[PDB]
Amino acid sequence: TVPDRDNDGIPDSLEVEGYTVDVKNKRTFLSPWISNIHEKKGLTKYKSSPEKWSTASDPYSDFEKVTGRIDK
Amino acid sequence: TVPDRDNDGIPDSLEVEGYTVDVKNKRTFLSPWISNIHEKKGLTKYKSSPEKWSTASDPYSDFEKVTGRIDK
Amino acid sequence: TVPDRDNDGIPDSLEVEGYTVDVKNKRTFLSPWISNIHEKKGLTKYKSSPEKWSTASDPYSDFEKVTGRIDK
Amino acid sequence: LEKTKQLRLDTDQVYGNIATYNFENGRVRVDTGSNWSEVLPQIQETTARIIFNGKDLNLVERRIAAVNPSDPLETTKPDMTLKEALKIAFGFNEPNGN
Amino acid sequence: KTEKEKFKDSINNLVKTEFTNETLDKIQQTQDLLKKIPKDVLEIYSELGGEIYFTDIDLVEHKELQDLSEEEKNSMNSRGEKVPFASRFVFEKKRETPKLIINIKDYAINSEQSKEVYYEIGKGISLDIISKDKSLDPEFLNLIKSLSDDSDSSDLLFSQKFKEKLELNNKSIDINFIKENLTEFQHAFSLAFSYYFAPDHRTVLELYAPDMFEYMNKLEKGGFEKISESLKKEGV
Ligand SMILES: [Ca+2]
Ligand SMILES: [Ca+2]
Ligand SMILES: [Ca+2]
Ligand SMILES: [Ca+2]
Ligand SMILES: [Ca+2]
Ligand SMILES: [Ca+2]
Numbered sequence: 001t002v003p004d005r006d007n008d009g010i011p012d013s014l015e016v017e018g019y020t021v022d023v024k025n026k027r028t029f030l031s032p033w034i035s036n037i038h039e040k041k042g043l044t045k046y047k048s049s050p051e052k053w054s055t056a057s058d059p060y061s062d063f064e065k066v067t068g069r070i071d072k
Numbered sequence: 073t074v075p076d077r078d079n080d081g082i083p084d085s086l087e088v089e090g091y092t093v094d095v096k097n098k099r100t101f102l103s104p105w106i107s108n109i110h111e112k113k114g115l116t117k118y119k120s121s122p123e124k125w126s127t128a129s130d131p132y133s134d135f136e137k138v139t140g141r142i143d144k
Numbered sequence: 145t146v147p148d149r150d151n152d153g154i155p156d157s158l159e160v161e162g163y164t165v166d167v168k169n170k171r172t173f174l175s176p177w178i179s180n181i182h183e184k185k186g187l188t189k190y191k192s193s194p195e196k197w198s199t200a201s202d203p204y205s206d207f208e209k210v211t212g213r214i215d216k
Numbered sequence: 217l218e219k220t221k222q223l224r225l226d227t228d229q230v231y232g233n234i235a236t237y238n239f240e241n242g243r244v245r246v247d248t249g250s251n252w253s254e255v256l257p258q259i260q261e262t263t264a265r266i267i268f269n270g271k272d273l274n275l276v277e278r279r280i281a282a283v284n285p286s287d288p289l290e291t292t293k294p295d296m297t298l299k300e301a302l303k304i305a306f307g308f309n310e311p312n313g314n
Numbered sequence: 315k316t317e318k319e320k321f322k323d324s325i326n327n328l329v330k331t332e333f334t335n336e337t338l339d340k341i342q343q344t345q346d347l348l349k350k351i352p353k354d355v356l357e358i359y360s361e362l363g364g365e366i367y368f369t370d371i372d373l374v375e376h377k378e379l380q381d382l383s384e385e386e387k388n389s390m391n392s393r394g395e396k397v398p399f400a401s402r403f404v405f406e407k408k409r410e411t412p413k414l415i416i417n418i419k420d421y422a423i424n425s426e427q428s429k430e431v432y433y434e435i436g437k438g439i440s441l442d443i444i445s446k447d448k449s450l451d452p453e454f455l456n457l458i459k460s461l462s463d464d465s466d467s468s469d470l471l472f473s474q475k476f477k478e479k480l481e482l483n484n485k486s487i488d489i490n491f492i493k494e495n496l497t498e499f500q501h502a503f504s505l506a507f508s509y510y511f512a513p514d515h516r517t518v519l520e521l522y523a524p525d526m527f528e529y530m531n532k533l534e535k536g537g538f539e540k541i542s543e544s545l546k547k548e549g550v
Contacts, residue, residue, distance in 0.1 A: 002514055003327065005171070011514050013425035016170045024521055026088045026122055027077070031518055036469055047294040050170055055293055056281040057216075057258040059234050059250075071235055071244055072129070078242065125242035133241075146331050151318065153325050169423045170292045174329045181336060207325075212289030216261040 005051050009063040012050040019046055021066050028067060077123055081135040084122035091118055093138050100139060149195055153207040156194035163190055165210050172211060229253070262290055268306055278305045337370060340418040344368055347421040347428055351435065351511055354538035358439045361545040365413040373405055373417055382407075390501070392433040392508060394473045403427070406434045414438060429512050436507025440500045443533065443541055450492050450499060457529055458502070459486060467523035471502050506530055 002011045010019065010030060018033035020043045031038075033045045048055045048062040055062055064070040074083040082091065082102065090105030092115045103110070105117045120127040120134045127134055136142045146155040154163065154174065162177035164187040175182075177189050192199045192206045199206055208214045217223060234255070235246040263279040280301040284290040302308045333339075348366070356364075369376060386407075391397045406414040414434060421428045444450055461467045462480060469477065476498045483491055492499065509519045510530045519527045 005324070005327065007324070012171065013514050017426055027084070028123060029517065029521055031521075032515060034470070034518070037466065037522065040469075049292040049294065051172060051289060051292045056279070057255070057262050059236060059255055064237060069237055069239075069242075071237070079240065129242075131243060153321070154329060155331060158329075165288045167288060167291050168420070170294075171423060172288050172292065172328060175333050176330070178333060210288070211328075212287045216258050 006049075006053045006062075008053050008061045010048075015048045015050040015062065017047075019066075020044060030063075030067070078121075078125045080125045080133040087120045087122040087134070089119075092116060093118075102135075102139070150193075150197045152197050152205045154192070159192040159194045159206070161191070163210075164188060165190075174207075174211070262293075264296075264301070266301065266305060270306075276306065280305050337418070340370075340420055341368065343421045343423075344416060344418045347431060348416075350513075351432070352534070352538065354542050355435070355439055358442065358538060358542050358545065359412070359435070361542070361549055362442065363411045364438060365411070367413070367415045368418055369415060370418055373402055373415060374400060376415060378413070378415070379405065379407060390473075392430060392505060394501075404430050404434055406438055408438075412438060425512065425514060429508050429515070432508040432511050433504050436504035436511075437500065440503050440507075441496075442545065443537075444499065444503060450496075454503075454529075455486070455492075457526065458499070460525055461523065462486070464523070467526060470518075470522045471505050471526070473498060473501060476502075510534075 004011050014032050019030060020033050020038050021028055021030050046066055053061050060070050076083050086104055091102060092105055092110050093102050094113060094115055118138055125133055132142055148155050158176050163174060164177050164182055165172060165174050166187055190210055197205050204214055231251055233246050233248055234250055235244050238245055259279060264282040265279050267275050267277050269275045280296055281293050282296045283293050373379060387399045388396045403417045416431060419427055444454055480486060506526050509515045
């Protein structure tokens with residue numbers, strides 16, 4: 001098990017210390033930020049708050065905004 | 073059990089790598105795409121997204137469309 | 145276990161003898177009031193009632209009030 | 217009204233619903249029991265507003281989340297600088313340091 | 315029904331029922347960092363005289379590291395670069411006896427400082443898992459050969475010196491190549507060890523290096539057991 005206070009499908013250390021979302025074959029994989037791999041792909045390094053379901057207090061979680069499973 | 077992320081009743085390796093649908097006696101079978109067998113039958117090779125329940129974002133799943141369990 | 149009559153989420157001896165709330169890295173931490181450890185940090189000493197879910201009878205608990213999980 | 221011709225239209229408030237995701241079947245379904253008047257006062261109190269008309273003289277109001285140091289839940293948000301807010305909210309960049 | 319039951323679990327980490335001290339929580343957090351590696355790797359370390367110490371003295375004015383070189387004061391971290399020894403808070407010293415000194419912190423909240431201990435531990439038991447006949451295991455050589463071909467696990471694990479040296483050799487084919495770059499071959503094992511045992515870093519290792527993940531997974535459920543047995547039998 002891994003702790004997840006806000007219950008938004010992404011653990012606490014990733015939200016505090018930086019994460020990103022990447023695809024490998026056709027599946028999306030949320031991963032902690034590694035500069036040696038996620039800079040050559042040209043990705044973004046997100047940081048959110050580990051005790052809010054949505055850091056900007058709007059009705060779309062931090063998981064959905066980064067994953068794209070959201071209102072289009 | 074085979075993985076199936078989107079819950080559309082069809083496994084992810086088949087959605088990524090190709091599949092097809094054909095009846096044998098009076099029953100429907102969904103099969104991985106084999107060029108040595110399925111091409112002479114005259115079938116069609118589908119692909120879709122393993123993360124989306126419906127690849128075109130319309131309310132009919134990828135299983136329902138190719139199988140026939142759909143609004144006629 | 146730790147008794148909690150009013151079901152506000154903070155145990156009863158803390159409500160009788162004092163408690164305080166602070167964040168540590170990016171995570172909130174509810175703690176009992178230790179005198180010569182928190183007073184030099186400048187936190188507050190809350191005391192409440194261990195029988196009421198909301199000590200001022202308003203529809204916000206003691207836990208949501210001191211934690212910030214409230215209507216903003 | 218026929219003498220002076222002055223009649224305008226104010227806008228006091230706007231009702232309207234949110235449409236959230238459904239993990240079960242991927243669809244997006246409007247919930248009819250929640251409007252934005254439970255949401256927008258919570259955005260207006262935990263964020264910071266930046267208005268900007270550098271794109272053909274049109275004001276583009278945005279809001280970036282920012283820390284309020286007297287609230288224990290709001291002190292858990294990441295530290296947001298003015299350069300980072302201008303970079304991620306509008307689309308500034310620094311190709312030569314500037 | 316389950317409403318208050320899950321509301322209690324959602325605050326089960328937040329409320330702190332008895333606190334009563336400050337430096338006692340760092341001790342508990344360090345111990346629960348350490349006790350979630352398996353029981354076998356600690357015996358593998360303690361076979362060759364391994365030592366794990368918990369101090370609050372920062373690693374400059376500690377009594378047992380006052381007399382050291384400059385090439386050991388300039389050693390590389392998990393990221394590859396050298397760390398200033400004012401900044402280093404975890405160090406393994408093995409000039410004659412393998413000894414690892416851990417400064418206590420709040421490791422349950424800090425899963426970045428919690429990875430350097432896993433890196434130095436994987437540095438500790440590294441050669442004794444790699445080496446069998448005073449030489450790098452040819453299965454591990456096949457592993458490094460397979461990882462250098464994949465363009466993603468390559469730049470995940472190897473330091474940039476290793477990749478910029480290997481294409482000059484274009485093939486890890488020489489008996490001198492293993493004897494000339496054993497530090498990198500040790501670092502590649504310790505980095506995968508730290509990625510495996512940090513519990514939010516396993517899915518990095520699973521997708522970015524799937525055949526290194528299976529090597530560590532085979533090592534996990536009984537490889538440590540066999541190497542501990544083959545060390546403790548020759549331990550007399
Ligand atoms: Ca979270
Ligand atoms: Ca969050
Ligand atoms: Ca599927
Ligand atoms: Ca699908
Ligand atoms: Ca109570
Ligand atoms: Ca109460």
